[model samples]
Every structure is written in C-alpha cells, then in structure tokens.
Target: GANPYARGPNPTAASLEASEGPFTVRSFTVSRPSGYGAGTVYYPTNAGGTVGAIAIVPGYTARQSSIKWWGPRLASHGFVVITIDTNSTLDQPESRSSQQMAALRQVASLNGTSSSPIYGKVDTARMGVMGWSMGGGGSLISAANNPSLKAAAPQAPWHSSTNFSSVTVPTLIFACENDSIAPVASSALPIYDSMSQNAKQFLEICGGSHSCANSGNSNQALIGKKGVAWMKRFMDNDTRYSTFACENPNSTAVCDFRTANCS
Candidate 1:
C-alpha cells in the first residue's frame, strides 16, 4: 500500500538539505493566541492533502527566531508547522511544555476555522513537538504527557530531570557537544537514555555549542534532513523515510550518534 500521507518527491540527502521542499509554503500570524504567546503558522499551500502539524518553542529567554527556520522547512515538506513564543521568555520547561501543547491546540482549532489560512490544511490527529534548551526539555515533557503524539525532535534540550521513561512517542534529540549551558552528558544524553520504552535517537554535533542546532547554525543539510525524515517516518508512518531516519549520517560534523528501536 502506498503511503497516503507521504508528500513531495522521494527524499535524497541533497533534497532535505535544501532550504525548502517540494511544496510552496505560505504563513500567517496567529492573531489571538489562546494558551501561549505570539505564533506564526506556516503551511504548504499545496501539500496534496491534510498533513500533520508540528509546534516548536524556543528555550528560556529566547524568541521565535531561535526556532523559526523549522516552520517553513517542515511545512514545505508537507506538514503544518508553528513556531511560537512562550507566555514569557523566561518560562521553565514545564511552562514551555504547556505552551507547546497550547500552540498545537490552536493549530487544530485554526484547521477547522473557515477564515483561517490553515483551515482544513492540518491533520489534527497527527502532530509533533520541538523546542530548544529548556523548551527542548519541554518538548520531551509534552511527549511524556501526550503519548498519542507522533514524534518529537528537540535541539540542545535542557530539562531539570532526565527521567522520561513514560514517553512512548518516537523522539530525536539533537545534542551540542560543547554546550556548557546544557552539557550533553548531563542534559541531552541522560534524557535520551532515560527514554527506555520508545523509539529514539541522539545526534551530537562535533564541537558545537548550545545554539548549534538552533537557527544560524552551519549544518542545515544534515540537521534539516534528519529532522524532516524523523517526522515523516513517525508522524506519517511513511516507511520510505526509514533509511533516512535510522541510518547514521556518517559526517565529520557529527560527533556521536545512537539509536534504539528505530530499524
């Protein structure tokens, strides 16, 4: 059976590295945010069908700019993506987690709202979450709280506690090897190791900082490819992306990589 949710041409390393995918993307600002702060929704104008939605959040004291690149990148590949600002820039992981979910709910609501640009464009049942630093930890918390979520991929995630054994959703953690603020050993790796019951992967960037995977980083080709592949494989259940999602990227830019239950 062909994958009904699969969009765009067959993915290649080069294709995913490009800034945009096969679909043209259009964006609209969320005028009245329900549970979170400001939000910008990016959706593919012609995705061929309803696609999953993803909500991304920035870390403590950060704004949408930190995670904004993902909105168009994922949307162009056939998912409705919203990058949001938390109620406060200093919000903790728990607060960030709540805001991340809130943003998704709003995305769902807009999908049914006739006047909304994303109306009928989102597959409400399928969704994912992402964030950076504390917000990244918040993404993990969101996954733990919402087992039905299809996927989560956070960059340089920093959470207070690392025990996320209850999370069953597929997750990908992007680690920065030299992140002093949220060192991979204490933050990212421990968090990844604790997720013992789900499909997960950890990719560490060589000599990277906390903001390595965030916007303005240099490794968009690998990071973007992996992020999109993970979502497509899990969110859409498109097996065509299995190889791209599971195989080691094998680049000098990546310092370490590990995966479990991802074959």
Candidate 2:
C-alpha cells in the first residue's frame, strides 16, 4: 500500500511551524514513581486559562514520531499534547498494554499538586486521550479501565469487543474505508457499540486507505481539526465547537465522507 500518510517533511513541518496560532510548544518529562519506565511530556507553551492536556499513544510498529504532525497543530490550538513511546517492538503486544497503564498513571500523577512539573499548567479535571492503530486499541483499553479520562479519540483502532468494553469515557472512533489491517467491522463499529450508554461517542467513516488517518490530506486534516473541536468542547469546557460533537445531524457541522469535508 502506498504510504498516503507519508508527506515530505519539509512542507508538513514548515506549515505546522508557520501556523499563526495563539499557542506555543514546550517539552517536559514525567518520572515514573515506581513500576514501568519514565516518560516524556510535550505541551503547548504559555498556556493560560484552564489548560487542557492530551496523551497520545502510538500504534503497532510505530513510535512517537508518527504523531508529530498532530502535536504542533494541537499545541497551536491551545492544548498540551503528550505523545508517549511505549518502547515496544512489533511482535511484543504485552509491552504496549503495560505502557498504556504507565501512561495513565503518569497523567494522573501530573493532574494535581505543584510538585509535578505540569501542575497548575494542566486542567487535571479535564483530560483527554487519543491513540492510533495498536495505540488506539491501547487507548480503549486504558479508558475502559480508568474513569478519569474525560474523553477519547481513537484512529483506525484494532482489537475486538473484549477491548472495547473497557471504555467508559466519551469517545470518537475515526476509521477509514480501505483499512484492511483494522477494518471497520473488526474495529470501529464494534467498539462504538460496546461503550456505556452514558458515555458520549461518535464515528467518522472516511473513504480512504488505512494511512488516511495520518495523511496530511485535507480530509484527514479536517478530522484532526474536528477532533480538537470535540476535545475543546468536552475537555476544555469550550463551546465554540460543541455543536459539532453534540448535534450530530447538523449538516453544517458534520463532515461528510463523500465531499472531503476539510476544504
């Protein structure tokens, strides 16, 4: 399959850096208190007025760099996005699962108290998480077990009903039509259906290959933008984009898969 998500770094990096947004980027680290490994945290710079944070976990055979495209965009939009590297290889499934819990603990530890570097800088009361592929499956697994996650968004996720049942937080699953690796039947729909009724969830089935989820195409970009809006509404207590997530049938707010809704 063509690597649709693979855009030359020059334009992608430049465009991200050139965005004239109201936020900046900064790097921080979270030391493991006991079990597991210490993790790094990258957040938006100069955050003020109820800062929100997002922990991003990568998919199978992937690393933190795969999600770099989203970090700057999210930071620029006023969010502290943490991309975590679970340090696992393609064949070692258990490593990713263990790291997911480690990430949850790290985020919880940073939620309150000035002793933590991210203290006061993050709205611990309103935290969200997102993952891609295997990481997406990890997100569901982590959120299913942890009630603290306010919301979640998983891109082209894997696993089955057993994994989906673990999610209690509001979630949005972004799936691609051509994704053979984690087809909608095996991944997206089942997960959406298994969540608790009280938890909010949405689904976006875009017409593209599996790589579309990370591709820089406008279609993917719009999904990224909408995901941020959903987070802002539910996590940051911002209503500017609440209608999109809350009011599903609103044509203007909804992004249709056929039209490439981004432009």
By TM-score, who's the top model here?
1
Residue 203 shift from truth in candidate 1, angstroms:
0.2
Local accuracy of candidate 1 as per-residue lDDT tens digits, 1-263: 67878877888888988998999999999999999999999999998899999999999899999999888889999999999998989899999999999999999999999999988998999999999999999999999999999999999998889999999999999999999999999999999999989999999999999999888889988999999999999999988899999999979899999999995
List model 2 lDDT by residue over 1-263, tens digit each: 43221111222222323432356666666655323344557665565544666777777767777665666666666666677776654623345555766665566567565776566566665667787887777777767667677777778777644346555577777777667888776676666667654345554544656656663644534565557656765665554455555544322323332211111
Question: Where does model 2 exceed 4 Å of error?
Answer: 1-21, 28-40, 91-97, 107-119, 160-166, 199-201, 215-220, 247-263
Please, what is the TM-score per model? 0.99, 0.74
lDDT of each: 0.93, 0.60
Shift in Å, residue 122, candidate 1:
0.6
**Model 1: colliding residue pairs:** none
The lDDT of model 1 is 0.93
Show where candidate 1 strays beyond 4 Å: none
Give each prediction's root-mean-square deviation over alpha carbons. Answer: 0.7, 9.1
